[PDB]
Design an enzyme around this catalytic site. Structure first.
Site, PDB file in Angstrom:
ATOM      1  N   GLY A  10      16.500  32.273  38.330  1.00  0.00           N
ATOM      2  CA  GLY A  10      16.318  32.074  39.840  1.00  0.00           C
ATOM      3  C   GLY A  10      17.584  31.756  40.505  1.00  0.00           C
ATOM      4  N   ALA A  11      18.647  31.830  39.988  1.00  0.00           N
ATOM      5  CA  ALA A  11      20.053  31.517  40.713  1.00  0.00           C
ATOM      6  C   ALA A  11      20.762  32.969  40.923  1.00  0.00           C
ATOM      7  CB  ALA A  11      21.058  30.771  39.914  1.00  0.00           C
ATOM      8  N   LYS A  12      21.596  33.033  41.835  1.00  0.00           N
ATOM      9  CA  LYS A  12      22.504  34.414  42.215  1.00  0.00           C
ATOM     10  C   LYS A  12      23.677  34.279  41.655  1.00  0.00           C
ATOM     11  CE  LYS A  12      19.860  35.730  46.206  1.00  0.00           C
ATOM     12  NZ  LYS A  12      20.015  35.658  47.551  1.00  0.00           N
ATOM     13  N   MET A  13      24.396  35.317  41.018  1.00  0.00           N
ATOM     14  CA  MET A  13      25.454  35.458  40.265  1.00  0.00           C
ATOM     15  C   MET A  13      26.421  36.370  41.038  1.00  0.00           C
ATOM     16  SD  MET A  13      26.190  35.929  36.383  1.00  0.00           S
ATOM     17  CE  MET A  13      27.943  35.856  35.605  1.00  0.00           C
ATOM     18  N   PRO A  14      27.566  35.872  41.552  1.00  0.00           N
ATOM     19  CA  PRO A  14      28.437  36.700  41.940  1.00  0.00           C
ATOM     20  C   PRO A  14      28.886  38.106  40.869  1.00  0.00           C
ATOM     21  CG  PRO A  14      29.212  34.923  42.573  1.00  0.00           C
ATOM     22  CD  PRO A  14      28.268  34.679  41.472  1.00  0.00           C
ATOM     23  N   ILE A  15      28.851  39.301  41.694  1.00  0.00           N
ATOM     24  CA  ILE A  15      29.079  40.677  40.752  1.00  0.00           C
ATOM     25  C   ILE A  15      30.440  40.745  40.278  1.00  0.00           C
ATOM     26  CG2 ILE A  15      26.750  41.478  41.230  1.00  0.00           C
ATOM     27  CD1 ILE A  15      28.185  43.681  42.888  1.00  0.00           C
ATOM     28  N   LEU A  16      31.375  40.057  41.062  1.00  0.00           N
ATOM     29  CA  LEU A  16      32.772  40.137  40.779  1.00  0.00           C
ATOM     30  C   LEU A  16      33.450  38.995  40.350  1.00  0.00           C
ATOM     31  CD1 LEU A  16      35.468  41.780  40.587  1.00  0.00           C
ATOM     32  CD2 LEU A  16      35.438  41.729  42.725  1.00  0.00           C
ATOM     33  N   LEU A  18      36.669  36.485  38.459  1.00  0.00           N
ATOM     34  CA  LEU A  18      38.142  36.558  38.033  1.00  0.00           C
ATOM     35  C   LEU A  18      38.036  35.848  36.364  1.00  0.00           C
ATOM     36  CD1 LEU A  18      41.207  36.619  38.597  1.00  0.00           C
ATOM     37  CD2 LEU A  18      41.023  34.141  38.810  1.00  0.00           C
ATOM     38  N   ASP A  44      35.507  33.309  35.149  1.00  0.00           N
ATOM     39  CA  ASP A  44      34.992  33.415  33.883  1.00  0.00           C
ATOM     40  C   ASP A  44      35.924  32.605  32.908  1.00  0.00           C
ATOM     41  OD1 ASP A  44      33.173  34.367  31.633  1.00  0.00           O
ATOM     42  OD2 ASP A  44      35.416  35.003  30.975  1.00  0.00           O
ATOM     43  N   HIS A 111      29.709  31.930  22.698  1.00  0.00           N
ATOM     44  CA  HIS A 111      30.948  33.040  23.119  1.00  0.00           C
ATOM     45  C   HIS A 111      30.792  34.238  21.879  1.00  0.00           C
ATOM     46  CE1 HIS A 111      35.238  32.844  24.126  1.00  0.00           C
ATOM     47  NE2 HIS A 111      35.005  34.259  24.134  1.00  0.00           N
TER      48      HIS A 111
HETATM   49  N1  LIG Z   1      33.333  37.001  26.056  1.00  0.00           N
HETATM   50  C1  LIG Z   1      34.437  37.569  25.326  1.00  0.00           C
HETATM   51  O1  LIG Z   1      34.435  37.673  24.177  1.00  0.00           O
HETATM   52  C2  LIG Z   1      35.536  38.064  26.194  1.00  0.00           C
HETATM   53  C3  LIG Z   1      35.589  37.678  27.627  1.00  0.00           C
HETATM   54  N2  LIG Z   1      36.557  38.314  28.373  1.00  0.00           N
HETATM   55  C4  LIG Z   1      36.674  37.768  29.616  1.00  0.00           C
HETATM   56  O2  LIG Z   1      37.116  39.098  30.531  1.00  0.00           O
HETATM   57  C5  LIG Z   1      38.088  38.847  31.265  1.00  0.00           C
HETATM   58  C6  LIG Z   1      38.825  40.316  31.398  1.00  0.00           C
HETATM   59  O3  LIG Z   1      39.130  40.881  30.073  1.00  0.00           O
HETATM   60  P1  LIG Z   1      40.751  41.125  29.767  1.00  0.00           P
HETATM   61  O4  LIG Z   1      40.413  41.443  28.140  1.00  0.00           O
HETATM   62  O5  LIG Z   1      41.449  39.967  30.192  1.00  0.00           O
HETATM   63  O6  LIG Z   1      41.450  42.379  30.336  1.00  0.00           O
HETATM   64  P2  LIG Z   1      41.223  43.251  31.739  1.00  0.00           P
HETATM   65  O7  LIG Z   1      40.582  44.612  31.395  1.00  0.00           O
HETATM   66  O8  LIG Z   1      40.677  42.496  32.575  1.00  0.00           O
HETATM   67  O9  LIG Z   1      42.842  43.586  31.851  1.00  0.00           O
HETATM   68  C7  LIG Z   1      43.731  42.723  32.379  1.00  0.00           C
HETATM   69  C8  LIG Z   1      44.929  43.324  32.338  1.00  0.00           C
HETATM   70  O10 LIG Z   1      45.073  44.168  33.496  1.00  0.00           O
HETATM   71  C9  LIG Z   1      46.235  43.801  34.382  1.00  0.00           C
HETATM   72  N3  LIG Z   1      45.437  44.150  35.628  1.00  0.00           N
HETATM   73  C10 LIG Z   1      44.705  43.572  36.552  1.00  0.00           C
HETATM   74  N4  LIG Z   1      44.589  43.874  37.505  1.00  0.00           N
HETATM   75  C11 LIG Z   1      45.250  45.164  37.329  1.00  0.00           C
HETATM   76  C12 LIG Z   1      45.625  45.903  38.544  1.00  0.00           C
HETATM   77  N5  LIG Z   1      44.933  45.984  39.704  1.00  0.00           N
HETATM   78  N6  LIG Z   1      46.568  46.947  38.484  1.00  0.00           N
HETATM   79  C13 LIG Z   1      46.912  46.955  37.205  1.00  0.00           C
HETATM   80  N7  LIG Z   1      46.962  46.256  36.149  1.00  0.00           N
HETATM   81  C14 LIG Z   1      45.847  45.159  36.453  1.00  0.00           C
HETATM   82  C15 LIG Z   1      46.499  42.343  33.973  1.00  0.00           C
HETATM   83  O11 LIG Z   1      47.837  42.175  34.375  1.00  0.00           O
HETATM   84  P3  LIG Z   1      48.281  40.902  35.255  1.00  0.00           P
HETATM   85  O12 LIG Z   1      47.374  39.678  34.784  1.00  0.00           O
HETATM   86  O13 LIG Z   1      49.568  40.499  34.685  1.00  0.00           O
HETATM   87  O14 LIG Z   1      48.408  41.204  36.653  1.00  0.00           O
HETATM   88  C16 LIG Z   1      46.136  42.424  32.508  1.00  0.00           C
HETATM   89  O15 LIG Z   1      47.324  42.762  31.712  1.00  0.00           O
HETATM   90  C17 LIG Z   1      39.181  37.860  30.173  1.00  0.00           C
HETATM   91  O16 LIG Z   1      40.170  37.644  30.803  1.00  0.00           O
HETATM   92  C18 LIG Z   1      38.059  37.042  29.918  1.00  0.00           C
HETATM   93  O17 LIG Z   1      37.655  36.086  31.150  1.00  0.00           O
HETATM   94  C19 LIG Z   1      37.340  39.235  27.589  1.00  0.00           C
HETATM   95  C20 LIG Z   1      37.549  39.569  26.291  1.00  0.00           C
HETATM   96  C21 LIG Z   1      36.332  38.923  25.305  1.00  0.00           C
HETATM   97  O1  LIG Z   2      37.285  36.224  22.437  1.00  0.00           O
HETATM   98  C1  LIG Z   2      37.573  36.305  23.611  1.00  0.00           C
HETATM   99  O2  LIG Z   2      36.990  35.823  24.471  1.00  0.00           O
HETATM  100  C2  LIG Z   2      39.076  37.105  23.883  1.00  0.00           C
HETATM  101  O3  LIG Z   2      39.714  37.210  22.544  1.00  0.00           O
HETATM  102  C3  LIG Z   2      40.116  35.950  21.825  1.00  0.00           C
HETATM  103  C4  LIG Z   2      40.511  34.893  22.734  1.00  0.00           C
HETATM  104  C5  LIG Z   2      41.293  33.825  22.228  1.00  0.00           C
HETATM  105  F1  LIG Z   2      41.719  32.734  22.995  1.00  0.00           F
HETATM  106  C6  LIG Z   2      41.261  33.798  20.959  1.00  0.00           C
HETATM  107  C7  LIG Z   2      40.897  34.579  20.231  1.00  0.00           C
HETATM  108  C8  LIG Z   2      40.381  35.953  20.659  1.00  0.00           C
HETATM  109  C9  LIG Z   2      40.066  37.005  19.743  1.00  0.00           C
HETATM  110  S1  LIG Z   2      40.866  37.345  18.407  1.00  0.00           S
HETATM  111  N1  LIG Z   2      38.557  37.559  20.031  1.00  0.00           N
HETATM  112  C10 LIG Z   2      38.128  38.412  19.223  1.00  0.00           C
HETATM  113  C11 LIG Z   2      36.950  38.051  18.232  1.00  0.00           C
HETATM  114  C12 LIG Z   2      36.918  36.437  17.976  1.00  0.00           C
HETATM  115  C13 LIG Z   2      35.677  36.175  17.290  1.00  0.00           C
HETATM  116  C14 LIG Z   2      35.138  36.826  16.665  1.00  0.00           C
HETATM  117 BR1  LIG Z   2      33.408  36.529  15.703  1.00  0.00          BR
HETATM  118  C15 LIG Z   2      35.226  38.354  16.774  1.00  0.00           C
HETATM  119  C16 LIG Z   2      36.292  38.620  17.642  1.00  0.00           C
HETATM  120  F2  LIG Z   2      36.418  40.130  17.822  1.00  0.00           F
END
Ligand SMILES: NC(=O)C1=CN([C@@H]2O[C@H](COP(=O)(O)OP(=O)(O)OC[C@H]3O[C@@H](n4cnc5c(N)ncnc54)[C@H](OP(=O)(O)O)[C@@H]3O)[C@@H](O)[C@H]2O)C=CC1
Ligand SMILES: O=C(O)COc1cc(F)ccc1C(=S)NCc1ccc(Br)cc1F
Length: 316
Positions: A10-16, A18, A44, A111
């Site tokens: 029932g809550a709303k989540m911003p689509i964009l 950080l 995030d 996670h």
């Molecule tokens: N649930 C999970 O397992 C995971 C969750 N995540 C979440 O998703 C987020 C986003 O994914 P992430 O893997 O960090 O990578 P992204 O795909 O968001 O890419 C981040 C990279 O892109 C660069 N960048 C950002 N904006 C621009 C732009 N406008 N032009 C050029 N380069 C740009 C950043 O540089 P700079 O910062 O130097 O500007 C950084 O090096 C993570 O930070 C985390 O919060 C990610 C992986 C796993």
């Molecule tokens: O995980 C993130 O959000 C971003 O990535 C990470 C972020 C961290 F702070 C530390 C490790 C990871 C790694 S290595 N993540 C990949 C990963 C971890 C666990 C398992 Br199960 C599989 C897998 F593929």
């Protein structure tokens, strides 16, 4: 576009939002302050990212400054794999709350589906380099998550990196009390995830796309790996729309009814990445971007691939 999506709680989540993985602790406080100043309302986070205290300093300052109200923010964190233990989930959540300067989270995610042995190390390994599992399964961990809702610590619960059959397991849990609100998965033009996304959307779960830019700062990047930001086919779509390639890559999941969480610590890019509400990709653009799928993943980890709940053996 409408800026928020309705969740099944029932809550709303911003689509964009950080992203904050890899944001250095000496840069992320300013990044989050800038983000809130330019309009971001969703951050995030995760305990494993080791920067929640510094994220929290920014959130608290902007709340104190009355730039925003708490109700207008949507703060997400995640339960790390070493805390899939009935008796450890609450304390893990409370540590994240204490670090972020909050009395509730808007969304708390499992996670990864895999539980690891508890302890100080985030990736406990055996002497041959394999992660050491926990015996606790995704259903019992889910029950522990449900308790957090009932204690007021979190407004919504969800999952991350769950494959089709793991989502189904959760949905088919005996005695399920709260459905997952969100599944947060890797998604971008080279890993388009159509199958998993349709399954989740058909079940009313909202999908969040992580690594939408292809995570060019991932620590295991190789030269030579494909690069979304440098793909001239994507650059051409961006030029046509008078936008940057990053802006196209962010708008793409938005038009698939996904939430998207690009990471930056660069103030100019934080702003650039938010300016994605004043153009539309055509259906032909969308289909063209989808055509670039190559089943390529940023996030995978060899040390965890034998864990019985490792998610990426299944097709989707
Ligand atoms: N649930 C999970 O397992 C995971 C969750 N995540 C979440 O998703 C987020 C986003 O994914 P992430 O893997 O960090 O990578 P992204 O795909 O968001 O890419 C981040 C990279 O892109 C660069 N960048 C950002 N904006 C621009 C732009 N406008 N032009 C050029 N380069 C740009 C950043 O540089 P700079 O910062 O130097 O500007 C950084 O090096 C993570 O930070 C985390 O919060 C990610 C992986 C796993
Ligand atoms: O995980 C993130 O959000 C971003 O990535 C990470 C972020 C961290 F702070 C530390 C490790 C990871 C790694 S290595 N993540 C990949 C990963 C971890 C666990 C398992 Br199960 C599989 C897998 F593929």
């Amino acid at each position: 576009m409408a800026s928020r999506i309705l969740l099944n709680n029932g809550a709303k989540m911003p689509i964009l939002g950080l992203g904050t993985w890899k944001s250095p602790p000496g840069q992320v406080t300013e990044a989050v302050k800038v983000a809130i100043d330019v309009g971001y309302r969703h951050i995030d986070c995760a305990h494993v990212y080791q920067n929640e205290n510094e994220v929290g300093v920014a959130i608290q300052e902007k709340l104190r400054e009355q730039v925003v109200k708490r109700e207008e923010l949507f703060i997400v964190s995640k339960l790390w794999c070493t805390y899939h233990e009935k008796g450890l989930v609450k304390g893990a959540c409370q540590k994240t709350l204490s670090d972020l300067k909050l009395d509730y989270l808007d969304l708390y995610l499992i996670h990864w589906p895999t539980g690891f042995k508890p302890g100080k190390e985030f990736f406990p390994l055996d002497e041959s380099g394999n992660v050491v599992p926990s015996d606790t399964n995704i259903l019992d961990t889910w029950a522990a998550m449900e308790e957090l809702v009932d204690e007021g610590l979190v407004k919504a619960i969800g999952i991350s990196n769950f494959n089709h059959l793991q989502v189904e397991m959760i949905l088919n849990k005996p005695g399920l009390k709260y459905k997952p609100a969100v599944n947060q998965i890797e998604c971008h033009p080279y890993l388009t995830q159509e199958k998993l996304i349709q399954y989740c959307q058909s079940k009313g779960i909202v999908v969040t796309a992580y690594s939408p830019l292809g995570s060019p700062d991932r620590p295991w990047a190789k030269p030579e790996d494909p690069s979304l930001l440098e793909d001239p086919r994507i650059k051409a779509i961006a030029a046509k729309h008078n936008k940057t390639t990053a802006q196209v890559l962010i708008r793409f999941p938005m038009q698939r009814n996904l939430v998207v969480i690009p990471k930056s610590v660069t103030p100019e890019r934080i702003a650039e990445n938010f300016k994605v509400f004043d153009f539309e990709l055509s259906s032909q653009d969308m289909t063209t971007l989808l055509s670039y799928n190559r089943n390529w993943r940023v996030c995978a980890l060899l040390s965890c691939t034998s864990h019985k709940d490792y998610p990426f053996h299944e097709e989707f």
